[PDB]
Design a binder for this molecule. Structure first.
Ligand code: ADP
Ligand code: MG
Ligand code: ZN
Lengths: 103, 530, 210, 105, 110
RNA sequence: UAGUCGGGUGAUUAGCCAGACUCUAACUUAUUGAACGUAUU
């Protein structure tokens, strides 16, 4: 499954705040955020596909970015959402600001 | 003692080790050289000076067998016969014996496995106990390592003891010498029919670490391998290879060079990407610059898999979706492991597991897959198409050139690729009183499959329970009965053959041939009569 | 592969002109009766019995669009394009499976006798004939490669089996060279060689007999 | 119902084989239906009879030194009672007789 | 599975196609269809069933058409309830049939 | 081919040289006791 805006209301009034959920989520976001227009991205993917051994990793990354861009484009107004990179930064800031002696 | 000194100086390994233990330099080096010395042959393959293999196995009142002796080949032994002849029983017996080496390499005085008091004693044995006797060889300095596993039937008052001390004594040498100075270690593995399991990527083992060397012995004789452990270990290797910056710098340098060539070739659209990668490279170089053994390990295993598994040309780890996925190029298409057919997955699992273990246990060899060991595979043809059956043994032996393989098969196609000396064949009307197994009379390697079926496996070329299977035979008999002339009866059958098999069928061509030769024979006979 | 005897040119090829007209336009049932007379219900290249079959341009329409409605260039080949993919010998393999080939370096069976170039072993391989060098070797090797006359297992096996069926007879006839006088024995050999025209893989069976 | 061997997933119909399988020889089914050689092509010994025949035909049907060596290899490997050796013997006999006819002519 | 479910229980649901594994990786339309036609004597020459599944991103939902399976299964169920009839056997034996025997033969729970 | 037997050489349990053998097919063992060989008397 992918995540959706209204997952924020899932188990909000009993079951929230579990360490294992955080760690799993956080590692997931990190892996995704390690490393543009859809038409431009489509063109870049097409150019990289034509070149394709050493560039295969880059092609897979760009295909993923294209799919994500299309999905975001296809996704509804009601489910509008910040980038995973921004989300990660905000949560990190929140933790460091609030939790005693974690900088 | 002076006696041990003499034997040790004569080249006896056990004596040298005993002297080492009592005086706790020279003797240590003797033991370590005995294990580690070897040479590279004309073909470029490393060969240990002191080989390790199973020489002989004897079974007494074990399952179906009253008393059975098997002499094994140093390289490859294949056991054949009908279902219920005890092929699996033989491999089980060996695997239990090998468990005693594995237990004692892991732990001083470790316990191996046992014969079952419920199932393993022959049902109609007058003495109510069973024995599995094995003799192993380890170079000319230790020509005989005898082991016996024994068990008495449930509720028998007299209990029969196993004799496992020689196994323990040899395994002690490996364990103790390794502790002082690292050595290569033998691989023992059993792959039974349980290796065909459904794959689950998600269920992860938390019972030990996967990167620790002795994890290579974990569940090694359990019958399924641990393909789950392979996947975890392979992802681990990937993460470590990505993390060390010089390979990343080298990879980044290669990517920058490839991208620069594309920009020089007129593709101005990738200039933005080149600038980004150049920046990343500069940053990586700026970060504190210093070959990973992990990188080499990864490469060895990848090569092994791709060489042995015909449909797989490439294997790699992708993390970019947010979860670690192993992907393969299967028949030109990039797929996940879960998307592989059962046949491909099961075979991949076998080779992957074996390669992992050999890499972990042979860190001092240039090619770790040239390590020593004994590998047991039940029903090697399991889920394999005939095309694959024609390559499997050749590929395995090429990838693992010093392993002793002990194999069972039902496949004539597999047998066509193996020399008769490697084959051990049950007599068809055995009933479990045969004393010694023997090789077939016919040479199998390079022979036609039809011949192997009939001469070696005692199976007719045509299915006996189909009437049409007898028609050509009957047709021939009719021709011979009517002095070679096509009578009403022969013509009817000819027409039936033609109608059923068709105009360009082998069967009809044979019939036509019979007519032509018999006509010519008769003409000769008439000329002779005149 | 047999030496073929092309004779008479059909009326329908005169009407259509290369360049303007397309191949799909023509009535193909008009063409077959003359090819069937020439080839005898058998393939040009492999000598299988034709059942699924198509008209083959020896030099293709893609590379040579001038050669389209020319009577030299047509041959009746085994296999059907329209029905299915995965036919892997003769005309279909020439186009797809054998990518890169010189069309000059192939045995045109109407023009040339293939018996100078190709030898058929009783094991059911086809090989370059004994003592060829340079161009004649290159033509033998490429004909075998491009029409896939060994690589098709269905062909190789079907040919091997056909030859091996008659090898008791070939053995038995030549033992009776001793006892019979020439006029009897030469009548026997001519009779056999007569029968195998109606049989499939006739060139392979000839080399066994002669 | 058989898949084509070089199916890249775009096959629209599964089809029946051309040969009748019921009551047919297994070796034929291997080659004609399963697309597998009856003899393993990746074994050198599988080619010896073919090579032997070619040598015999190169030397006008007479056993030369090279053909004799290979004959002995076939005999040594497959055995005196092997079908392969019988085929070799047959080849010798037939080719010798053909050559005798050629010399008479 | 749709016949079996509805023989057992009115409006029982059979099994669905997987969104992850059953859809072709490069499918332009991003859905999969399994269409089957069954025969039950000359009275019921065609029983068409379609199982459908759309990929995760969902431009439009493609629904399965299983009503004919349910209708036929209902006939078997209802008539059997009134008077015992013979019922069809449906079984799949895949490679999972190869598994070890547990000796521990369980309770006659009934 | 391999394994095996072993006459010679060799500061010698190695290596090298020579000759031979081949039932599917050796794996060198244990004392103070017993027996055998040698020493002692
Ligand atoms: N304890 C036993 N006593 C007698 N016969 C047994 C016993 N255990 C197994 N068997 C017999 O041995 C055979 C087991 O075959 P197995 O070892 O699986 O060989 P294979 O894999 O060649 O079929 C069966 O014929 C079975 O009846
Ligand atoms: Mg004494
Ligand atoms: Zn053809």
């Amino acid at each position: 499954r992918r995540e959706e805006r209204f997952d924020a209301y899932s188990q909000t009034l009993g079951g929230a705040g579990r360490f294992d959920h955080f760690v799993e989520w956080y590692i997931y976001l990190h892996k995704r955020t390690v490393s543009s227009s859809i038409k431009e991205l489509e063109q870049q993917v097409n150019d990289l596909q034509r070149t394709v051994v050493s560039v295969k990793s880059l092609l897979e990354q760009m295909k993923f970015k294209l799919s994500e861009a299309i999905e975001r484009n296809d996704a509804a107004v009601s489910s509008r959402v910040l980038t995973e990179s921004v989300q990660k930064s905000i949560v990190e800031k929140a933790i460091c600001s609030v939790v005693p002696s974690i900088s | 003692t002076k006696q041990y000194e003499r034997k040790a100086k004569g080249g006896n390994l056990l004596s040298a080790f005993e002297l080492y233990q009592r005086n706790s330099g020279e003797w240590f080096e003797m033991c370590r050289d005995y294990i580690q010395d070897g040479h590279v042959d004309e073909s470029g393959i490393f060969r240990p000076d002191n080989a390790f293999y199973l020489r002989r196995l004897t079974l007494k009142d074990f399952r179906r067998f009253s008393l059975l002796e098997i002499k094994l080949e140093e390289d490859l032994t294949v056991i054949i016969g009908n279902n219920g002849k005890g092929k699996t029983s033989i491999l089980y017996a060996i695997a239990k014996t090998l468990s005693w080496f594995v237990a004692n390499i892991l732990k001083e005085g470790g316990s191996g496995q046992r014969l079952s008091e419920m199932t393993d004693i022959k049902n109609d044995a007058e003495d109510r106990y069973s024995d599995v006797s094995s003799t192993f060889f380890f170079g000319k300095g230790l020509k005989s390592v005898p082991i016996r596993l024994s068990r008495s039937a449930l509720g028998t008052a007299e209990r029969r003891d196993s004799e496992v001390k020689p196994a323990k004594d040899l395994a002690d040498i490996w364990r103790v010498i390794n502790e002082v100075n690292t050595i290569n270690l033998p691989t023992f593995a059993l792959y039974n029919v349980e290796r065909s399991q459904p794959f689950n990527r998600n269920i992860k083992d938390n019972t030990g670490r996967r990167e620790e060397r002795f994890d290579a012995y974990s569940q090694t004789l359990g019958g399924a391998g641990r393909f789950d452990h392979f996947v975890e270990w392979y992802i681990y290797l990937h993460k470590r290879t990505v993390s060390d910056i010089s390979s990343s710098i080298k990879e980044l340098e290669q990517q920058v060079n490839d991208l620069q060539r594309t920009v020089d070739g007129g593709m101005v659209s990738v200039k933005s990407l080149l600038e980004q990668m150049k920046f990343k490279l500069s940053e990586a170089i700026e970060r504190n610059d210093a070959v990973l053994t992990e990188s080499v390990q990864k490469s060895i295993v990848e090569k092994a898999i791709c060489s042995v598994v015909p449909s797989i040309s490439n294997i790699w780890v992708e993390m970019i979706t947010g979860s670690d996925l192993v992907k393969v190029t299967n028949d030109g298409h990039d797929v996940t492991i879960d998307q592989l057919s059962d046949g491909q997955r099961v075979f991949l699992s076998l080779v992957a597991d074996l390669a992992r273990r050999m890499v972990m246990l042979n860190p001092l060899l240039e090619n770790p897959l040239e390590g020593r060991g004994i590998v047991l595979i039940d029903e090697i043809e399991l889920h394999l198409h005939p095309k694959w059956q024609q390559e499997v043994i050749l590929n395995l032996r090429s990838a693992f050139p010093n392993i002793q393989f002990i194999i069972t098969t039902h496949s004539p196609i597999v047998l066509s690729t193996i020399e008769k000396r490697c084959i051990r064949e049950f007599e068809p009307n055995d009933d479990g009183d045969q004393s010694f197994l023997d090789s077939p009379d016919m040479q199998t390697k390079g022979s036609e499959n039809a011949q192997i079926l009939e001469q070696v496996m005692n199976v007719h070329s045509t299915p006996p329970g189909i009437a049409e299977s007898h028609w050509l035979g009957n047709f021939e008999l009719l021709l011979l009965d009517n002095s070679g002339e096509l009578d009403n009866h022969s013509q009817v059958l000819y027409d039936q053959i033609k109608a059923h098999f068709g105009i360009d069928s082998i069967e009809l061509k044979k019939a036509d041939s019979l007519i032509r030769i018999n006509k010519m024979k008769n003409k000769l006979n008439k000329i002779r009569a005149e | 592969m047999r030496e073929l005897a092309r004779l008479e040119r059909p009326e329908i090829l005169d009407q259509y002109i290369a360049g303007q007209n397309d191949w799909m336009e023509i009535d193909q049932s008009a063409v077959w009766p003359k090819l069937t007379e020439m080839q005898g219900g058998f393939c040009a290249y492999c000598e299988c019995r034709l059942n699924r079959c198509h008209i083959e341009h020896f030099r293709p329409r893609g590379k040579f669009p001038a050669l389209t409605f020319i009577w030299n260039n047509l041959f009746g080949s085994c296999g059907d394009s329209r029905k299915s993919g995965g036919w892997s010998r003769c005309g279909i393999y020439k186009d797809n499976g054998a990518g890169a080939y010189n069309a000059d370096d192939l045995i045109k069976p109407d023009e040339e006798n293939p018996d100078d170039y190709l030898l058929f072993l009783t094991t059911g391989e086809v090989v370059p004939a004994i003592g060829l060098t340079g161009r004649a070797l290159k033509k033998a090797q490429e004909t075998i490669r491009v029409f896939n006359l060994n690589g098709d297992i269905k062909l190789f096996g079907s040919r091997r089996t056909a030859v091996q069926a008659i090898m008791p007879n070939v053995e038995y006839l030549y033992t009776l060279l001793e006892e019979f006088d020439e006029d009897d024995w030469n009548e026997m050999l001519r009779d056999e060689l007569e029968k195998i025209e109606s049989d499939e893989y006739k060139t392979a069976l000839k080399h066994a007999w002669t």
